[PDB]
Amino acid sequence: QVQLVESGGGLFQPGRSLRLSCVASGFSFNEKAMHWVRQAPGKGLEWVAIIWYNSIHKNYADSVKGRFTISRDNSKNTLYLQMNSLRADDTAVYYCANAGGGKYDYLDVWGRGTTVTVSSASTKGPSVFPLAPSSKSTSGGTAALGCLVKDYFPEPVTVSWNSGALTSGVHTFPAVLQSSGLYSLSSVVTVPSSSLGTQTYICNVNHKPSNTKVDKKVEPKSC
Amino acid sequence: WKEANTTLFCASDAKAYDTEAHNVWATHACVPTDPNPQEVVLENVTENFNMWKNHMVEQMHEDIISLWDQSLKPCVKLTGGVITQACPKISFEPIPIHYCAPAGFAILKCNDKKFNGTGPCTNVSTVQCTHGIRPVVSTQLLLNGSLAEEEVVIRSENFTNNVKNIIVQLNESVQINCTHCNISREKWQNTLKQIVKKLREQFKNKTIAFAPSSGGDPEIVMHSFNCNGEFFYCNTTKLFTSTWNVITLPCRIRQIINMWQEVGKAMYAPPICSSNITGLLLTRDGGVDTTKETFRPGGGNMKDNWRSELYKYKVVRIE
Amino acid sequence: YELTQPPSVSVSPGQTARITCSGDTLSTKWSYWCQQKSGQAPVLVIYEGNKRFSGTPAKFSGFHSGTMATLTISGAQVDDEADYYCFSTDSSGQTWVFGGGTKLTVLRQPKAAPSVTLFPPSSEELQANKATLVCLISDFYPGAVTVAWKADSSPVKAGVETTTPSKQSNNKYAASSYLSLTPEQWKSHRSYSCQVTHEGSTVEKTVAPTEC
Ligand SMILES: *[C@@H]1O[C@H](CO)[C@@H](O[C@@H]2O[C@H](CO)[C@@H](O[C@@H]3O[C@H](CO[C@H]4O[C@H](CO[C@H]5O[C@H](CO)[C@@H](O)[C@H](O)[C@@H]5O)[C@@H](O)[C@H](O[C@H]5O[C@H](CO)[C@@H](O)[C@H](O)[C@@H]5O)[C@@H]4O)[C@@H](O)[C@H](O[C@H]4O[C@H](CO)[C@@H](O)[C@H](O)[C@@H]4O)[C@@H]3O)[C@H](O)[C@H]2NC(C)=O)[C@H](O)[C@H]1NC(C)=O
Ligand SMILES: *[C@@H]1O[C@H](CO)[C@@H](O[C@@H]2O[C@H](CO)[C@@H](O[C@@H]3O[C@H](CO[C@H]4O[C@H](CO)[C@@H](O)[C@H](O)[C@@H]4O)[C@@H](O)[C@H](O)[C@@H]3O)[C@H](O)[C@H]2NC(C)=O)[C@H](O)[C@H]1NC(C)=O
Ligand SMILES: *[C@@H]1O[C@H](CO)[C@@H](O[C@@H]2O[C@H](CO)[C@@H](O)[C@H](O)[C@H]2NC(C)=O)[C@H](O)[C@H]1NC(C)=O
Ligand SMILES: *[C@@H]1O[C@H](CO)[C@@H](O[C@@H]2O[C@H](CO)[C@@H](O)[C@H](O)[C@H]2NC(C)=O)[C@H](O)[C@H]1NC(C)=O
Ligand SMILES: *[C@@H]1O[C@H](CO)[C@@H](O)[C@H](O)[C@H]1NC(C)=O
Ligand SMILES: *[C@@H]1O[C@H](CO)[C@@H](O)[C@H](O)[C@H]1NC(C)=O
Ligand SMILES: *[C@@H]1O[C@H](CO)[C@@H](O)[C@H](O)[C@H]1NC(C)=O
Ligand SMILES: *[C@@H]1O[C@H](CO)[C@@H](O)[C@H](O)[C@H]1NC(C)=O
Ligand SMILES: *[C@@H]1O[C@H](CO)[C@@H](O)[C@H](O)[C@H]1NC(C)=O
Ligand SMILES: *[C@@H]1O[C@H](CO)[C@@H](O)[C@H](O)[C@H]1NC(C)=O
């Protein structure tokens, strides 16, 4: 029975390099080609590399070209993937799969990959911006507003409205890991279209890692 | 009966006084040819042959190694070490060699017209020796061999395994000349047509395609062989430029070579051949092509060169 | 080049589910299907179009034709819910590429059509020399969509950072996407558009720098 294990994953600050290994067993390793695949947290699979059984040929995705170098070793039944310059977006789970044959063939068996995390480990306070209502943002008798927390590290932030006095219709989204290496979050609440110019709405944000709290009043636009 | 691994004795038709190399070595390593080796035939009997599991291939390989090391002396060898050696220019000329079995044993020979290399064979015969075989250390193309009597035959321990190489024996012999190289384009095109016939008969009618090999050492990417003791390397891109459903090939001579004898690189000295095409070694590119299927030249393994000759023979023990 | 397959496939138990996969390279190249369950490594299901690797459930059929390969699942069950991927190669056969991923899920509540709201850059942000359009998607079920940004009528992919569909308080799903731009780019184009594809429907919301 086939078995593929991966190793080398961990946490590394950007700019560093790395080497991932993949031991195989249960099939003629010397007669098969191997693929490296990548999958960011909760994202679709992304192909990384392929290498032939004899190693004469091997190809990389245009994304990691020039940084990743794929290797192998049949005398040890081991596959290798070296990453010279680590980018934030390189953070993902790295699966090591075998090929149907030994020359540019489908990905048959997958071995549970290894998680690679790239993070600058550098604190930074958020920058809140206002998301005010407009014509289209109004869905009939109701409209929607919010605030946008931007470029903060390391998560998570809390966000309330009117110091937690507003809880109906409010909804917060998950954060993204922008290419810059930091996190951006967006919070929103829906309110009656009438109260836009009568009641005040203040977005409260708490980033405890930096010991910062940001209050940002959301005002409608002049038009 | 069951075949047994023994030390056959090669029977050559060589001459001692003559300067040539294979003759010098075969004089002291082989024996003269029997005027006739009685071909004791059997009709109502069959036996299992597996060309990919025959000790005769191994023994032959070791004999050719002993010939090259004993005879053709490379200038220098790099096999994880260093060595300085003389480089006498030798006369390299493959001669027909037989491989006879000693007393108590015999050689079962499959005399069936078409034989896919593996599986039982009918119309089996018994012999004491082997037909005329020339140890040709060629790649990509098989030369000075024994072509299939009727039509064409393709062989491989597993066609659906693209790593496993494919051996081919032709309907006719194709003339190839070298000194650069030349070769009748038309006869080549015809042989290609026949190969397409067999292959198409093998892979559910899928369209067949030819194309040169990609990557590899200069030995594998190019047709490498010997000529008067000098290593020839030729570019066979002109023989693979069409897809189905005269030619002159450029060549070089660089003595820096990768010894087929062992995983290492040995060199010779600068310097100071017309043959047949009796077989072909190919590899299939699996890929994902819906209808197209591409086959490219390859080799590098000499046991495949011997197996093209010792596929019907196999040792056996008797009273 | 690209393999486009639906984002979500809702299924009431027992019905026959079907997933597609369109790519101009499928004309001369096979399609290979794949399955990945929650927190598990993906697994092959169908290779070279029709062919199946026994013994896997025969209810998985592959109909490769033209530029469309269809993965059919007879009698979907609660176990079958998972993320499927059609993968292939480009015209050259040298590179491999995966589809966007299709989320097969059993219907536990009624299908909710996504509501989309696109917020253009704020004045303070611009005065900080930065711009970001914020597309927000809410109240959709099942929880899987695609997000395609466009400048004028042209697709844009540089600067797009999207989340994965999370769960609201009301048991429905909500996702967000961000398009990061410089003020110049925001002042040059006539209008940017966030596009959201949820099964059966694609909604698009446009903003312009001229508007407020
Ligand atoms: C020429 O070369 C080709 C290949 O290059 C070759 O084709 C392959 O031949 C080999 C064997 O020689 C095949 O490998 C074997 O396949 C066996 C079957 O595998 C399938 O079934 C597995 C489980 O089935 C059970 O459950 C079902 C119930 O539905 C039942 O019917 C079955 O009877 C059985 O009880 C399944 O696990 C397996 O899936 C795994 O393996 C494949 C491999 O690619 C992989 O894709 C999957 O991701 C997954 O890992 C598959 O669906 C298999 O049983 C056999 O197992 C070996 O190990 C066990 C140890 O317990 C031994 O008991 C067993 O005897 C074997 O040693 C082995 O894996 C291979 O599938 C062929 N591939 C093809 C045809 O495409 C040709 O034969 C060669 N032709 C020649 C020489 O002429
Ligand atoms: C497959 O078998 C072929 C036939 O043996 C191989 O081709 C032959 O290889 C030998 C090298 O050992 C060549 O020998 C050379 O011949 C030339 C020319 O001969 C001259 O001398 C004679 C005198 O009788 C004269 O009649 C001729 O007109 C020539 O003037 C010599 O100059 C060399 O010194 C050397 O003896 C054969 O010539 C050659 N056969 C040919 C060209 O027909 C072939 O190499 C084998 N394939 C392999 C190894 O891959
Ligand atoms: C070579 O010939 C043998 C004959 O046994 C092949 O083995 C079987 O041949 C029969 C044809 O009657 C097929 O139905 C079987 O499927 C074959 N068995 C297997 C496992 O394939 C053998 O396949 C042939 N080998 C090659 C390379 O063609
Ligand atoms: C390659 O070499 C062979 C001879 O080894 C050539 O065969 C000759 O063909 C012509 C026909 O026009 C005959 O008249 C000759 O007698 C043949 N030669 C011999 C020795 O018999 C063949 O023509 C050569 N082909 C090329 C392209 O050079
Ligand atoms: C066995 O050999 C004889 C020839 O001696 C032949 O006539 C016969 O057809 C063969 N097969 C039999 C008897 O089944
Ligand atoms: C004997 O011969 C068979 C096949 O010819 C081979 O598989 C086996 O390895 C050989 N054994 C030895 C000791 O040479
Ligand atoms: C067996 O092979 C020989 C060739 O060596 C042939 O003469 C004979 O006719 C064959 N016997 C058959 C086909 O029955
Ligand atoms: C090539 O084949 C012909 C007959 O097919 C034969 O007469 C000739 O001797 C062969 N040439 C060599 C060098 O063996
Ligand atoms: C091989 O040559 C013979 C001529 O006797 C011919 O009958 C046969 O068809 C040829 N093989 C092919 C075309 O595959
Ligand atoms: C053989 O000829 C082709 C022509 O394009 C060339 O690409 C290839 O590099 C040549 N191989 C050599 C010189 O080994």
Author numbering:
A (entry chain H): 1 to 52, 52A, 53 to 82, 82A, 82B, 82C, 83 to 100, 100A, ...
B (entry chain G): 45 to 124, 199 to 297, 330 to 354, 356 to 396, 413 to 439, 445 to 463, 465 to 492
C (entry chain L): 2 to 9, 11 to 95, 95A, 95B, 96 to 106, 106A, 107 to 211
Study authors write:
Here we report the isolation and structural characterization of CAP257-RH1, an N276 glycan-dependent CD4 binding site antibody representative of the early CD4 binding site plasma response in donor CAP257. Here, we isolated and characterized a CD4bs antibody called CAP257-RH1, which recognizes an N276 glycan-dependent epitope targeted by early members of the CD4bs plasma bNAb response that developed in donor CAP257. CAP257-RH1 together with HJ16 and 179NC75 form a subclass of CDR-H3-dominated CD4bs antibodies that are critically dependent on the N276 glycan but not D368 (28, 36, 60).
A cocrystal structure of the CAP257-RH1 Fab region bound to RHPA core gp120 was determined to 3.2-Å resolution. The structure included an (N-acetylglucosamine)2(mannose)5 (NAG2MAN5) glycan at position N276 bound in the paratope (light green) and confirmed the CD4bs as the target for CAP257-RH1 neutralization. The interface between CAP257-RH1 and RHPA gp120 buries a total surface area of ∼1,184 Å2, to which the heavy chain contributes ∼593 Å2 and the light chain contributes ∼594 Å2. The CAP257-RH1 paratope is centered on its 11-amino-acid-long CDR-H3, which accounts for ∼53% of the heavy chain interface. In concordance with data from plasma mapping, CAP257-RH1 does not interact productively with D368gp120 despite having a CDR-H2 that extended toward the CD4 binding loop (similarly to VRC01), where H56HC forms a hydrogen bond with the S365gp120 backbone carbonyl oxygen (left). The interaction between E31HC and N279gp120 explains the antibody's preference for an N279gp120 immunotype, as a negatively charged aspartic acid immunotype at position 279gp120 would clash electrostatically with the glutamic acid in CDR-H1. In addition to these heavy chain interactions, CDR-L2 of the light chain also contributes to N276 glycan interactions by inserting F55LC between the second NAG moiety and the D2 arm of the glycan as well as a hydrogen bond with the backbone carbonyl of S56LC (right). While interactions with the conserved CD4bs (loop D and the CD4 binding loop) are mediated exclusively by the CAP257-RH1 heavy chain, the light chain is positioned close to V5, with its CDR-L1 binding perpendicularly over the V5 loop apex.
